Design an enzyme around this catalytic site. Sequence first.
Site, PDB file in Angstrom:
ATOM      1  N   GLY A   1     -29.553  79.373  44.464  1.00  0.00           N
ATOM      2  CA  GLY A   1     -30.520  78.589  43.728  1.00  0.00           C
ATOM      3  C   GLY A   1     -31.082  77.707  44.813  1.00  0.00           C
TER       4      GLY A   1
ATOM      5  CG  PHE B   1     -27.397  73.380  48.438  1.00  0.00           C
ATOM      6  CD1 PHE B   1     -27.026  73.582  47.117  1.00  0.00           C
ATOM      7  CD2 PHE B   1     -28.164  72.268  48.745  1.00  0.00           C
ATOM      8  CE1 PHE B   1     -27.422  72.696  46.122  1.00  0.00           C
ATOM      9  CE2 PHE B   1     -28.521  71.352  47.761  1.00  0.00           C
ATOM     10  CZ  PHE B   1     -28.161  71.579  46.451  1.00  0.00           C
ATOM     11  N   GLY B   2     -27.050  78.102  49.905  1.00  0.00           N
ATOM     12  CA  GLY B   2     -26.182  79.226  50.245  1.00  0.00           C
ATOM     13  C   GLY B   2     -25.542  79.966  49.090  1.00  0.00           C
TER      14      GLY B   2
ATOM     15  CG  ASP C   1     -34.314  69.925  54.125  1.00  0.00           C
ATOM     16  OD1 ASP C   1     -35.467  69.469  53.848  1.00  0.00           O
ATOM     17  OD2 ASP C   1     -33.844  70.960  53.603  1.00  0.00           O
TER      18      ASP C   1
ATOM     19  NE  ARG D   1     -36.111  70.741  49.949  1.00  0.00           N
ATOM     20  CZ  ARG D   1     -37.244  70.105  50.217  1.00  0.00           C
ATOM     21  NH1 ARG D   1     -38.080  69.783  49.242  1.00  0.00           N
ATOM     22  NH2 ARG D   1     -37.545  69.779  51.461  1.00  0.00           N
ATOM     23  CG  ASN D   2     -31.427  69.354  50.445  1.00  0.00           C
ATOM     24  OD1 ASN D   2     -31.052  70.404  49.935  1.00  0.00           O
ATOM     25  ND2 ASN D   2     -32.328  69.337  51.404  1.00  0.00           N
TER      26      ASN D   2
ATOM     27  CG  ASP E   1     -28.019  71.643  52.032  1.00  0.00           C
ATOM     28  OD1 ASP E   1     -26.943  72.075  51.567  1.00  0.00           O
ATOM     29  OD2 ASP E   1     -29.103  72.277  51.972  1.00  0.00           O
TER      30      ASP E   1
END
Length: 300
Positions: free
Chosen positions: A23, A25-26, A158, A162-163, A176
């Site tokens: 979605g 982060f990995g 970053d 979103r993070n 992240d």
Amino acid sequence: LPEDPRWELPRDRLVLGKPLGEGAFGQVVLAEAIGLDKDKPNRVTKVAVKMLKSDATEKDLSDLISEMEMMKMIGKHKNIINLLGACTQDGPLYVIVEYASKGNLREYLQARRPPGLEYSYPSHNPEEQLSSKDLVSCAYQVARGMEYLASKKCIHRDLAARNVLVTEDNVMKIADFGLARDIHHIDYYKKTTNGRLPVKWMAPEALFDRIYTHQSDVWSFGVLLWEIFTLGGSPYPGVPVEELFKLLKEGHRMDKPSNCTNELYMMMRDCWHAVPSQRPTFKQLVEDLDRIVALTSNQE
Ligand SMILES: COc1ccc(C(=O)Nc2cc(-c3ccccc3)[nH]n2)cc1OC
């Protein structure tokens, strides 16, 4: 892989569940960890588990190990995604991190927007709403997480809503921060899962001179404040990479959101100082935001 008994969780103590990730982060699945803590070994904890895809390379594995290793060195804070354990022996590598049940900050804010009206894109009606104090508290928690990361000499590179992940208790957690810094790149034209361009959060000196500092993360935090006060708004909608560069070279700055005080807009503008040394630090932002939270009404 060598075993670290500080972090080792036996494989039979992890009950793998539904995918959460790819979605963002990995390769990530939701799971239940049995007895993560020694007091007691009979309780389950919902956790997020980072792992490698079937088509993963030696560099893909080395980057996951480095992220895990970086998290160990950074240590624990309430406002970051914390490391909880790892499955390193006799099977695929699993990196166990905190689960944030309310998803990322952009999603959380968008879902709590006021109800849709006859002119809207009108059925939107949440059973969840945020006061002006709640929005300022969100900014305060992210600044606190960043101040901690900066104190550990960690540069995010970053930072964006979103993070930032939101727990069941509405705690903001930066994600992240431990990712391996790629070389050289990155692809300025590469879009996120929701079709947004990460260049829109980058300080001009990071974008043009490839200089990443705590000062360039403060610029990103200014865009993140704008995302908070627009309730998950998209910076520069419809602006392609080449036009963003021209707006930056001209000293253009985003307009003041309507759900924002003059003081909070000047904080955003200060984060967006053309001179990196003139921007506030995360230590200053934490102090200013703590003062503002206490003076912001929760009545509207
Ligand atoms: C109710 O909606 C949602 C609920 C939870 C999530 C979610 O993904 N949670 C998550 C991801 C990580 C994690 C942290 C660091 C690294 C890797 C993963 N921790 N917690 C997404 C949702 O919607 C998309």
